[PDB]
Design a protein around this nucleic acid. Structure first.
Ligand SMILES: [Zn+2]
Ligand SMILES: [Zn+2]
Ligand SMILES: [Zn+2]
Lengths: 175, 6
DNA sequence: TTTAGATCTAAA
DNA sequence: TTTAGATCTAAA
């Protein structure tokens, strides 16, 4: 079920250590066509918005939100793509969410299942993992259900979730 | 903010 | 085949 | 309305 590898935990793992572990995993799973000759410098052979696909930040942004299964509960264009080297301020990458999901399926989904990098934190308010809308506190980095924050004056959830949306600070951090 | 919908 | 951009739809 | 995912086109 799990890769042995002994790769560093995802909070402190370097990009090079991560990518070398992805290459080794893809080879042991028999997906030889995904690992070109020329080693790490040539991996992956995929381009997004005219730059080589940035698998490290794609992976970090998805597993920090609960993994690929969260699906369209992740804002791929607005919160995943924006953290990748492939992002540019002005771009016409209108199908980028679909593209990123396809690349994640190709390079990273089996890898995700074979590692222990997915965030499964509970709500800082109610202490459960109930399904629903969540926001990450910009101050402490913990996660809260939007519905568990009953303070007046909060925006609509969609205004937190849209690209470069509202700042969220949880009730425990707020001064 | 960083968000997710589960 | 792969990629960038137009234009559909879904959701809120 | 705005925002983003899916699909299609055309260029490599
Ligand atoms: Zn590994
Ligand atoms: Zn809660
Ligand atoms: Zn906080």
């Amino acid at each position: 079920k799990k890769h042995d590898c002994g790769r560093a935990h995802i909070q402190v793992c370097s990009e090079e250590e991560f990518l070398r572990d992805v290459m080794q995993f893809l080879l042991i799973r028999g997906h030889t066509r995904l690992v070109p000759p020329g080693g790490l410098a040539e991996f992956p052979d995929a381009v997004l918005n005219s730059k080589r696909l940035d698998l490290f930040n794609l992976y970090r942004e998805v597993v920090s939100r609960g993994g690929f299964h969260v699906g369209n509960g992740i804002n791929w264009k607005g919160q995943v793509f924006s953290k990748m080297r492939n992002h540019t301020l002005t771009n016409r990458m209108t199908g980028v969410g679909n593209t990123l999901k396809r690349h994640y399926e190709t390079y990273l989904l089996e890898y995700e299942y074979a590692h222990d990098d997915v965030d499964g934190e509970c709500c800082l308010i109610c202490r459960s993992s109930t399904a629903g809308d969540w926001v990450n506190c910009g101050s402490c980095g913990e996660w809260a259900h939007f519905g568990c924050d009953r303070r007046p004056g909060l925006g609509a959830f969609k205004d937190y979730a849209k690209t470069d949306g509202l700042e969220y600070v949880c009730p425990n951090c707020s001064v | 903010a960083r968000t997710k919908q589960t």
